[PDB]
Design a protein around this ligand. Structure first.
Ligand SMILES: [Zn+2]
Ligand SMILES: [Zn+2]
Ligand SMILES: [Zn+2]
Lengths: 84, 146, 50, 89, 237, 62
RNA sequence: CCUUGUCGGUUAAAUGCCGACCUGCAUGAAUGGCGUAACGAGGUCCCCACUGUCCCCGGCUGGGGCCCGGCGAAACCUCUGC
RNA sequence: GGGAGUAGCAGCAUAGCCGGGUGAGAAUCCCGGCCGCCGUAGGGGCCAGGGUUCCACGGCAAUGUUCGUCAGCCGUGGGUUAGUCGGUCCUAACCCGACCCGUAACUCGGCGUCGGGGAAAGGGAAACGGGUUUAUAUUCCCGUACCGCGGUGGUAGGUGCGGCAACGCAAGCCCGAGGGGUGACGCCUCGGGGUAGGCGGACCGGUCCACAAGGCCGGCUAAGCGUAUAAGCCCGGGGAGUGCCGUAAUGGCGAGAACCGGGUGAAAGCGCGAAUGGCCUCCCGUAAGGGGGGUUCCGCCGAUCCCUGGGGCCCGUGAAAAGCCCCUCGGGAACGAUCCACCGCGACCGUACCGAGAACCGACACUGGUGCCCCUGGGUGAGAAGCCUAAGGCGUGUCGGGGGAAACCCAGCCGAGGGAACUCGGCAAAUUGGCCCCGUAACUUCGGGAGAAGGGGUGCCUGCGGGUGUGUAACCCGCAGGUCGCAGUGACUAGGGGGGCCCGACUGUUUAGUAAAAACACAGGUCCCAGCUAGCCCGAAAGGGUUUGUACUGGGGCCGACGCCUGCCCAGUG
RNA sequence: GGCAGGGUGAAGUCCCUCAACAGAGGGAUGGAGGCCCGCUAGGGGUGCUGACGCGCAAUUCGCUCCCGUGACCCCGGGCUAG
């Protein structure tokens, strides 16, 4: 909001160093944005627990990644087994 | 030894042991009393009494509150806490915004506001523009809402 | 209120009764020989084995 | 205060007495409301209480008369409709 | 001398034992002697966090009524139907024998010998790839890179394990590591052997240095295997 | 330190209570056996040749 | 090690502190090397203020020490004692 | 025996005086008054532990750091009353036995299963108020209640209805089998409604004051039974986007908003319980006892107590089972309750007292420890701070008396002129200090540094104004004028600051009893073994730990946040 | 089972004015942290090299100093044995 460079890692203040603060901030920013649902198409999906994602509108609950709903290997497996 | 008498009298009179009074001219009659019945008789006859509670007055504090209401005792050398600790941060905002919203509904019910203008004013208030109803009304007047 | 077991209670009762001085007629009958015995116990000095 | 009442499962309450004592009374806590088996939404027409409280009620004051009283009405209607449509052939 | 931590762990004490009463039960498939040639159908009714697993688990209800836990694949939905058996389609979440799984498919939870319930490729974000089929063996590429042969009647499930990317984010604080270790009763915090006394470690002594090569033979006795055990090489590259 | 003050922590549950078989206060209440006679562990009595206590009880030489 | 090395700054006066020089008795790269904001009942040098720290010691307050009544031990002890 | 009629009976809570009494005997025991100490504990309640220390009468050889007529001491007799309180049920981590395996053997080591145990603060049927005893009471008595089992007699029902619906109803009995719910759960933060407690005014009845007004005391109502709204969820109608509705905040809507109506649903309040019951008070010979009175209204603050809903964080996900309510099936009988009224029965153990500067542990009537484990009125004030004070408790943190109290010591106050000349070293002491306004350097991982530094102001009285609010209710925020003092955060409370260098990144830990650190740990970096009947490990074996685990994993070493970097050598040892 | 009171103000959510190729500027909400002050309670033990040192005490007392929502403090039931 009112910070130039730090984001969610402004809770740290001075401590723990550049690399670590930057990485935490980036991971958390990409995680806390509302994602597209695979059942209804609306942007209403949030993380419940590590690996578990839920839509607020339709109530759809699915398993995914730790900090994002999808993974690269997951997309590849989907593509391949859609072929066969 | 009058400990027995004193303890029984306290339990009967629903008080403390140090608030019981025994007549110094009748200690021998009181020593002759070994039953709750006899202690009750002495209490009925006035040889053992309950002393009244003194009580702590509050008249000086009354006078202070009077003067503080009419404007004394509230200057800079009389304060010890931060202004935030004395007023509040969130409570002020709440009472402000609740007042504004109540007033806006009352107007829209009286008929003076249409829904579109009501909505835009609700949003301005939520955003923090006024800080009181006099400012709200000054804005409505400056504009053409009255 | 203080929650004792019954058997512990009975043992404490025996320890309580045990604790008194020699009777006077025993001293007389014995001609001042038996005048004290080995189990005078006071609750602040010597503790029992619960 | 006894240790059994230093335990925060007893919901203490202060009460003034006809003799002017102002004593503390202790009670156990109330269980929460019944929830639907499918959706986990709360149910209607089902009273809250401990077992002794529920045993001082008749049968028809404990649940609604309609069928499947363990389900919310939407889910109940789903079930009845599916039964119907499977009872066609 | 005195004992090492690795020797005290073998005794089986509370300081070292896993707290598995805290966990959800073990994860196994269904026995062959009850899924011989039936191709059972089930519905997913819950997805759960498991404290001893590193992967999320799913609760499947089968037709008879039996409920069971499975390791969840990336993408599986509550209310979805899965199939276990030989005539099950090739779809993320279904369990088939290796002889019925094409080449190029991504696979997890592979048995070592048929009927053993699942042994291989279980962690969050892992996957195996089917390489070759024959009539006597199926060759698979495991996440360590290694090629391994299985019996073609061994069962595996199709897809990727859920819970990947876990290590993309720093732990940051000592307290977070405290909680992460306490969850599975791992030895934490860890001491250094060079700052122990000589009675305690083969390293060890007041000048805080290893005074002999840290590479140790595969045939050394217990109490002496510390450092680099039977190392083929050491260093940067 | 290690002396007078830690002696105050002696109002917990006792290690040993009275024993049902032999009458001594030697029954370990967390483990469930007696440190003198073996009750709770042994159908037979605990008796060692290096010990003097049973000989004293029977007024025996060592 | 010679060592209070030499030059400069800080003082009326510097076996100290800081900065430079390099014959490094016997520095040096994960037995890590060089830096580093924030942090420290860590070690160390200086400036402002302050003071009985000192020049130079003085007067007051309570409790002991001293006399009176009562309870009443110990360490130590060859004999003695310019 | 000498030391010696000596030290100690001070320091952290310096407490007694006057009058009367008892008694052989009174600084030290009793009554009254004055003066004092504690007062988010030295007060109230109660575990473990102790075990009669509890009560009354009688005593003073010993104990009590003095005395003692006193006592937790001595003697003589007494005292603990339960269908509803706790234990007797359930499981947790864990333990044991049998079978089985091993051991030369065992009272030793294991073991899946079967069974049995395992919580006096976890889960878990049912009682409240008042009186009575020298000493027990939710246990005795009085009043008014509830639970379980078993009967008797009637009824609802079997064989009945109202609502579009959400739903509302007395809405059949016995035995068995499934299913659902509840039990049943973490940390942080916020709103709404209530209560205990407190405060202000009026009235009554009393009391303290030359008067005087004014101050102070009392002004009460349990379980149980009956009675309904709030949030939230829901049902009907209705039919929306250059948008409309709402919150402290996040939010909501053709996957059906606004708006009309409704249903279910807490803590509470109200009525009955219930009155010469409890409290206050007013007259008479005072033993029994006697007699008559009052028991009323508004308003404010309110929790750390109770209920109810929202939001946020986890590479971390925060018990289980008994028991209890509901539904559907299967098998039986023709009857018959989860409704009303009545009647009987309800075994065993604990229950006294302390709960700590004297009832526990420390050899003691020990400034330690166990337990600060649960709770606490008024004023100033941000405050459970410190200071004063009510209630309650104490004058026993158990020796006193003299003294214009010699030196000297312990703990404190002031000090002219100088201002670190003292000393290894500014050790110790001093200085600053609360709130409001102004203003704020280098350097920086851009978050900080920072309350940087530095400067002004602050009392009382008289009047004006603002915010929320229905309010001359209550809380909070500004202005002007007059006036006193050496001094207005006037006591209490309450930072001294700045600039260089070395080490360690930081919060954290350490040698109980001479070392708190530059030593340890830490996030992070990098190397090694291992595809599971593995790798590493315990053991005499049987068996076992990592493992309810499977390379984003498990084990083994070294460096130690972050930034810039990490050169050459495989002859030697491995 | 527990931790008075106060401060600072991270993400998230926005409002207004002037403009819109780009942007510029002013106001709020919200309540994170191994954050800050704090003899709240509790926990610890830096210095005086203070009192005591046949002690109140076989490791205590006082003044001063440190932590105080956390890798925190404490309790009942269990486990590891030379
Ligand atoms: Zn969706
Ligand atoms: Zn439902
Ligand atoms: Zn025995």
């Amino acid at each position: 909001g009112r910070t130039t460079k730090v984001g969610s890692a402004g809770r740290f203040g001075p401590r723990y160093g550049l690399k670590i603060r930057r990485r935490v901030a980036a991971v958390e920013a990409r995680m806390k944005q509302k994602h597209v649902c695979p059942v209804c198409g609306r942007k209403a999906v949030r993380r419940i627990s590590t690996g578990i994602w839920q839509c607020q509108k339709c109530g759809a609950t699915f398993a995914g990644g730790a900090y994002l709903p999808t993974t690269p290997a997951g997309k590849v497996a989907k593509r391949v087994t859609a072929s066969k | 030894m009058l400990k027995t008498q004193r303890r029984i009298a306290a339990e009967l009179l629903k008080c403390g042991e140090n608030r019981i009074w025994i007549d110094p001219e009748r200690i021998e009659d009181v020593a002759a009393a070994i039953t709750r019945e006899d202690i009750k008789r002495l209490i009925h006859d006035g040889v053992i009494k309950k002393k009244p509670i003194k009580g702590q007055s509050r008249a000086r504090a009354r006078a202070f509150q009077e003067a503080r209401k009419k404007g004394r005792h509230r200057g800079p050398g009389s304060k010890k806490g931060k202004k935030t600790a004395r007023m509040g941060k969130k409570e002020v905002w709440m009472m402000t915004i609740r007042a504004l919203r109540k007033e806006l509904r009352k107007l829209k019910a009286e008929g003076k506001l249409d829904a579109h203008t009501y909505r835009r004013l609700y949003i301005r208030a939520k955003g923090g523009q006024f800080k009181n109803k006099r400012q709200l009304y000054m804005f409505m007047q400056e504009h053409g809402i009255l | 209120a203080r929650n004792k077991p019954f058997a512990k209670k009975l043992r404490l009762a025996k320890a309580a009764k045990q604790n008194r001085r020699v009777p006077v007629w025993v001293i007389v009958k014995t001609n001042r020989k038996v005048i004290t015995h080995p189990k005078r116990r006071h609750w602040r000095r010597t503790k029992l084995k619960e | 205060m006894k240790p059994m009442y230093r335990s925060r499962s007893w919901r203490r309450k202060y009460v003034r007495t006809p003799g002017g004592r102002t004593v503390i009374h202790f009670e156990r806590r109330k269980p929460k409301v019944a929830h639907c088996a499918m959706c986990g939404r709360p149910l209607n027409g089902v009273p809250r209480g401990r077992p002794s409280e529920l045993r001082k009620l008749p049968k028809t004051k404990k649940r609604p008369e309609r069928p499947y009283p363990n389900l919310c009405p939407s889910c109940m209607r789903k079930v009845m409709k599916a039964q119907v449509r499977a009872s066609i052939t | 001398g005195k004992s090492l931590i690795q020797q005290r762990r073998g005794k089986g004490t509370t300081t070292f034992r896993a707290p598995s009463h805290r966990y959800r039960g073990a994860v196994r498939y269904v026995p062959l002697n009850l899924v011989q040639e039936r191709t059972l159908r089930g519905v997913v009714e819950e997805i759960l966090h498991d404290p001893g697993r590193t992967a999320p688990v799913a609760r499947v209800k089968f037709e008879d009524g039996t409920k069971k836990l499975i390791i969840a694949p990336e993408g599986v939905l509550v209310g979805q139907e899965i199939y276990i058996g030989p005539e099950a389609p090739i779809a993320i979440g279904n369990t088939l024998p290796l002889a019925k799984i094409p080449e190029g498919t991504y696979v997890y939870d592979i048995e070592g010998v048929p009927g053993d319930g699942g042994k291989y490729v279980r962690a969050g974000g892992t996957y195996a790839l089917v390489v070759s089929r024959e009539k006597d063996k199926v060759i698979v590429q495991l996440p360590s890179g290694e090629l391994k042969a299985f019996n073609p009647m061994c069962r595996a499930t199709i897809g990727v394990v859920a819970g990947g990317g876990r290590l993309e984010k720093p732990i940051v604080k000592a307290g977070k590591a405290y909680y992460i270790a306490k969850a599975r009763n791992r030895f934490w915090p860890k001491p250094r052997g060079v700052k122990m006394n000589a009675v305690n470690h083969p390293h060890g002594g007041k000048e805080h240095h290893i005074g002999r090569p840290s590479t140790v033979s595969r045939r050394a006795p217990p109490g002496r295997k510390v450092g680099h055990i039977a190392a083929r090489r050491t260093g940067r590259r | 330190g290690a002396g007078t003050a830690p002696k105050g922590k002696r109002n917990r549950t006792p290690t040993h209570i009275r024993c049902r078989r032999c009458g001594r206060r030697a029954f370990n209440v967390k483990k469930g056996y007696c440190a003198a006679c073996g009750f709770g562990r042994s159908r037979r009595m605990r008796k060692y040749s290096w010990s003097h206590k049973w000989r004293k009880k029977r007024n025996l030489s060592y």
